[PDB]
Ligand binder design. Structure first.
Ligand SMILES: [Zn+2]
Ligand SMILES: [Zn+2]
Ligand SMILES: [Zn+2]
Ligand SMILES: [Zn+2]
Lengths: 281, 282
C-alpha cells in the first residue's frame, strides 16, 4: 500500500522501555501524523514515575514516515515504501562528554494505527552531567537529517547532530548514527542521498499534572549547489565539490570494516565491531 | 486580571506589514489565530506586492507576545495582556551581524474581536550578496529565550534576545534584537520583574498554496532561578544566585543609557544626537 496509507491523518501510538544507568522507566505516547504537511503531533506520559532523563533527549527516539516528500522526490521515500510491514530503526546517540543511548525500534502498522515500539539502553552517563543532572532547557531546534542508501543491506544509514540548549546558555551536542532496515521481504525504495529538514517544538498541556511532553514536529525532504557542510562534524566543503567524496567523508565517521567496508556506530565498546571483523579471517 | 480575560480562548489574528529594505518596497498580510492558554500561535503570510526581497525567517520576530502562556504564579508579570485592548507600540532595532539592520514600529491592539499587528519596517546597510539580500537562509527556526525588563521611565518594557538563523552553508547568521513596548492607553499596566519568554517556532508550507508564503507556528511560554545565566546579547556569564539588579544593569549597558533620566537607545544611536538629548536636562 506504501504511500497510499499516508494520504490523510494517521493515528499514532508509541511505547518505550528504557534503562539508563540502571534507572528503569517506561513511556507511552499517543497522537497523530499528517504526511501531506509533514506534521506530527504526540503527547507522552511517563508511566513509571518521574522521568530519569530530560524529555528532549528522547525526541528523536519517539516516525520519519510522516515526512512530506515533494512530488519530485516520491521515489526516494524509503520510510513509507516499507509500510505497512514497516521497519526496524536502530540508533546510537553519543552525548558529547557524556553517555550514549542505544535504541532499537520497530515502526509499523497495527491495523489502522502507526506504532513506534522502542527499547532504549543508556550507559556511561555522568551523575551531574547535562542529562542526569537535568540541565537541558525544555525546547528544540532545527536540524538537517542526512540520508544515505545502504545498498548492501536493503535500507538506509542516517546521520545528524542535535543541538540541545543548556540552561546556562551552552549547548550539549548529540551525534546520531542511525540505520533503518525493512521488516518485510517486499522490495523498497533505495534513495539517492538527501536530507530531511526537521523542526520541532515541545510544549505542555496546562491541564496535565502528570509529567509529560507534547511534541510538535515538522519534517520535509530536500537536497544545495554551492557550500555543503558535514552532518556530524563542522567540516566545510568548497563550492561544487565531488559529491561522492562528500559521501565518502560522511561514511568515514562510521566505524568501517577494512575488508568489506561495512559500517558500525563508532562505539567505545569495540566488542561488536570485533565480532564482525572475525567473520572475514 | 483585566486584560488577560480577552485571551482566555482562541482569538483571531490579522497582520499587516509595509517594508522598505535598501529601497525594495514590499507588503505582507497575515491571518491566523492565537491561544494563550497554550502559548500556541498560528499564522499564514502572503507577499502582496510580488517577490519578497528578504527571506521569510528574517521577518518572524517582527510578524504578538500577548499570546504567551504565563503560568498562574506569574500572571502579575504579563505586561502584554494588561495593556489590551487599547494595546501597545512594539519598536525594535534588529542588527544582522556583518550586515544591515531592520528598524520596526508596530501597533498591536484589538480592532473589534480581532487582534492586530500593524507594522512599518525599514531596513538599511544590507550587503547585496549578503545572507539576507542573497537569500541564503534556510527555511527553519530555532528556540530562543526573550529576556524582559521593566522600564518605568516609559511605563513599559525593554526586551532583548539574539536570534540564530541557520545558513544553507551550515554557518549561522546572528541577529541582535533591541525591543521596547509601551502602552497605547492611559490605563495602568503591569510592570514586571525581570523574566523571560521561552519561544519555539516552526515554519512550514500549505501545499495547496501556490503563492510564495509562510506558515508560522509559535509556542511561547514564560519563566525565570539558581544556576549560571548567559547574558541575552553576549557570551559573558553570570554566576549562581547573582544580584539580579546588576544583571539588569549589565544588559542595559549593551544599550545607550542617558545618565540623567535613564532613557534607553539602541547601540547604533548617533553620538551627536545622544549628546543633544543629554543637553535637554540643562
Ligand atoms: Zn564530517
Ligand atoms: Zn567486514
Ligand atoms: Zn552582555
Ligand atoms: Zn536623559
Amino acid at each position: 500500500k506504501g504511500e497510499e496509507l499516508f494520504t490523510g491523518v494517521v493515528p499514532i501510538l508509541v511505547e518505550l522501555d528504557g534503562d539508563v544507568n540502571g534507572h528503569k522507566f517506561s513511556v507511552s505516547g499517543e497522537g497523530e501524523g499528517d504526511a501531506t504537511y509533514g506534521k506530527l503531533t504526540l503527547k507522552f506520559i511517563c508511566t513509571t514515575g518521574k522521568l530519569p532523563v530530560p524529555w528532549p533527549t528522547l525526541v528523536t527516539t519517539f516516525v520519519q514516515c510522516f515526512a512530506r516528500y515533494p512530488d519530485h522526490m516520491k521515489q526516494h521515500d524509503f520510510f513509507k515504501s516499507a509500510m505497512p510491514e514497516g521497519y526496524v530503526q536502530e540508533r546510537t546517540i553519543f552525548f558529547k562528554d557524556d553517555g550514549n543511548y542505544k535504541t532499537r525500534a520497530e515502526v509499523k502498522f497495527e491495523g489502522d494505527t502507526l506504532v513506534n515500539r522502542i527499547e532504549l539502553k543508556g550507559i556511561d552517563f555522568k551523575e551531574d552531567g547535562n542529562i542526569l543532572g537535568h540541565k537541558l532547557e525544555y525546547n528544540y531546534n532545527s536540524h538537517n537529517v542526512y540520508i544515505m542508501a545502504d545498498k548492501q543491506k536493503n535500507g538506509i544509514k542516517v546521520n545528524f547532530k542535535i543541538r540541545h540548549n543548556i540552561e546556562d546558555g551552552s549547548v550539549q551536542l548529540a551525534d546520531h548514527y542511525q540505520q533503518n532496515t525493512p521488516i518485510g521481504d517486499g522490495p523498497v525504495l533505495l534513495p539517492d542521498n538527501h536530507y530531511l529538514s526537521t523542526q520541532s517544538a515541545l510544549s505542555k498541556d496546562p491541564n496535565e499534572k502528570r509529567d509529560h511532553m507534547v511534541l510538535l514536529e515538522f519534517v520535509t525532504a530536500a537536497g544545495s549547489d554551492v557550500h555543503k557542510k558535514c552532518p556530524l562534524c563542522e567540516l566545510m566543503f568548497p563550492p561544487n565539490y565531488d559529491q561522492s567524496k562528500f559521501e565518502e567523508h560522511v561514511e568515514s565517521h562510521w566505524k568501517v570494516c577494512p575488508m568489506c567496508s561495512e559500517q558500525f556506530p563508532p562505539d567505545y565498546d569495540q566488542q561488536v565491531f570485533e565480532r564482525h571483523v572475525q567473520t572475514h579471517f
